[PDB]
Design an enzyme around this catalytic site. Structure first.
Site, PDB file in Angstrom:
ATOM      1  N   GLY A  10     -35.202  -8.725  48.861  1.00  0.00           N
ATOM      2  CA  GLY A  10     -36.264  -8.879  48.714  1.00  0.00           C
ATOM      3  C   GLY A  10     -37.182 -10.240  50.073  1.00  0.00           C
ATOM      4  O   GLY A  10     -36.542 -10.282  50.540  1.00  0.00           O
ATOM      5  N   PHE A  12     -37.280 -13.361  49.270  1.00  0.00           N
ATOM      6  CA  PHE A  12     -36.879 -14.494  48.772  1.00  0.00           C
ATOM      7  C   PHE A  12     -35.849 -14.085  50.208  1.00  0.00           C
ATOM      8  O   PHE A  12     -34.597 -15.730  49.873  1.00  0.00           O
ATOM      9  CB  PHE A  12     -35.918 -14.301  47.830  1.00  0.00           C
ATOM     10  CG  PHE A  12     -35.237 -13.572  47.391  1.00  0.00           C
ATOM     11  CD1 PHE A  12     -33.210 -13.695  47.915  1.00  0.00           C
ATOM     12  CD2 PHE A  12     -35.193 -11.797  46.461  1.00  0.00           C
ATOM     13  CE1 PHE A  12     -32.916 -11.859  47.586  1.00  0.00           C
ATOM     14  CE2 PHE A  12     -34.551 -11.255  46.087  1.00  0.00           C
ATOM     15  CZ  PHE A  12     -33.835 -11.156  46.886  1.00  0.00           C
ATOM     16  N   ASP A 119     -40.345 -22.169  41.123  1.00  0.00           N
ATOM     17  CA  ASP A 119     -40.452 -20.408  41.280  1.00  0.00           C
ATOM     18  C   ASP A 119     -39.643 -20.138  39.771  1.00  0.00           C
ATOM     19  O   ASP A 119     -38.664 -19.339  40.170  1.00  0.00           O
ATOM     20  CB  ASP A 119     -40.808 -19.829  42.082  1.00  0.00           C
ATOM     21  CG  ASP A 119     -40.915 -18.181  41.563  1.00  0.00           C
ATOM     22  OD1 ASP A 119     -42.048 -17.577  40.471  1.00  0.00           O
ATOM     23  OD2 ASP A 119     -40.584 -17.258  42.476  1.00  0.00           O
TER      24      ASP A 119
END
Length: 244
Positions: A10, A12, A119
Site C-alpha cells: 500500500g 505505506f 495515524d
C-alpha cells in the site's frame, strides 16, 4: 538479512517478512520508495530511533536497522487490529480496555520522546497473538511534536478530526485523543463511528446497545468537537471505564 513472503502492500510502502541471517530472528522489512513517500535519513527513521532509544513503550515496534529498506521487529504470530476485528468482530470491553491502555501508554512515550504518530487506527496497532500485546506500528505519516500546529494530514477522510475538516489545522495531542476516540469506538463497536463530514464536525454518536454507559461516556469525551473540550492522555487513564 533474508527477505521472505509479503505481508501487506500500500501507500505505506511494502512490508515483507524476513529474518536476520546470524541469529535467525524474525523481522519485518518495510520498503519505501524515494520520491513516493515524503544526516539525511527518512523522517520515519529519525522518529523510530528517538522512540526506540533506551527501549520502546514497549507497545511500539522498534527499528532494528535501515538501508529505502527499514528492518523492524516482527512478532510471530502477529495480526493487526483491523484484521482482528474483521475475523472476530468487536472485542468486548474487557479486552478493549486491555489493548486501549496499552495503546495510550505507547503513544504517551512517543510524546515524551517528542514524536507524534499522527495515524492511530486499527491497522496501525499490531497484536502479538502469543503475548496479547498491542504494538504501535508505522511512523510513515508521523512527525515531531511541537507547540505549533500541523497543516497536513495523510489519514483517510473518515478518520480526520473535525478541526481538520473545519480549518485544515490541528494540534498533536487533541488530534491524537480524537483518533483514540475513534480507535476505542472501533474496538468495542466493530466499525468506525463517522462516515460523512456532517457527522464528524457534529460528533453525532449513536452507540449500539452493548456499549456500557461508562464506556460511551469516555468515547464521547474523546470525540468532542471542540478540541479544548477533549481529555488528555493522563485523564483518559484515570477515566472510570479504564479502571478494572
Amino acid at each position: 538479512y533474508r527477505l521472505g513472503p509479503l505481508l501487506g502492500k500500500g501507500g505505506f510502502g511494502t512490508v515483507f517478512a524476513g529474518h536476520r541471517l546470524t541469529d535467525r530472528l524474525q523481522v519485518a522489512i518495510k520498503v519505501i520508495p524515494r520520491n513516493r513517500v515524503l544526516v539525511t535519513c527518512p523522517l520515519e527513521v529519525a522518529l523510530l530511533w528517538k522512540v526506540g532509544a533506551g527501549g520502546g513503550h514497549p507497545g511500539v515496534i522498534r527499528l532494528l536497522d535501515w538501508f529505502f529498506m527499514l528492518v523492524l521487529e516482527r512478532p510471530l504470530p502477529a495480526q493487526d487490529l483491523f484484521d482482528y476485528i474483521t475475523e472476530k468482530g468487536p472485542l468486548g470491553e474487557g479486552p478493549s480496555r486491555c489493548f486501549f491502555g496499552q495503546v495510550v501508554a505507547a503513544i504517551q512515550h512517543c510524546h515524551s520522546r517528542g514524536v507524534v504518530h499522527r495515524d492511530i487506527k486499527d491497522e496501525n496497532i499490531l497484536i502479538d497473538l502469543r503475548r496479547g500485546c498491542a504494538k504501535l506500528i508505522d511512523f510513515g505519516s508521523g512527525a515531531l511534536l511541537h507547540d505549533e500546529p500541523y497543516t497536513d494530514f495523510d489519514g483517510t477522510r473518515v478518520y480526520s478530526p473535525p478541526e481538520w475538516i473545519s480549518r485544515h489545522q490541528y494540534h498533536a495531542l487533541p488530534a491524537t485523543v480524537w483518533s483514540l476516540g475513534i480507535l476505542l469506538y472501533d474496538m468495542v463497536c466493530g466499525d468506525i463511528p463517522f462516515e460523512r463530514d456532517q457527522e464528524i464536525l457534529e460528533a453525532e454518536l449513536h452507540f449500539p446497545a452493548h456499549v456500557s454507559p461508562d464506556c460511551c461516556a469516555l468515547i464521547r469525551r474523546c470525540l468532542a468537537p471542540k478540541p479544548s473540550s477533549r481529555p488528555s492522555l493522563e485523564e483518559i487513564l484515570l477515566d472510570p471505564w479504564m479502571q478494572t
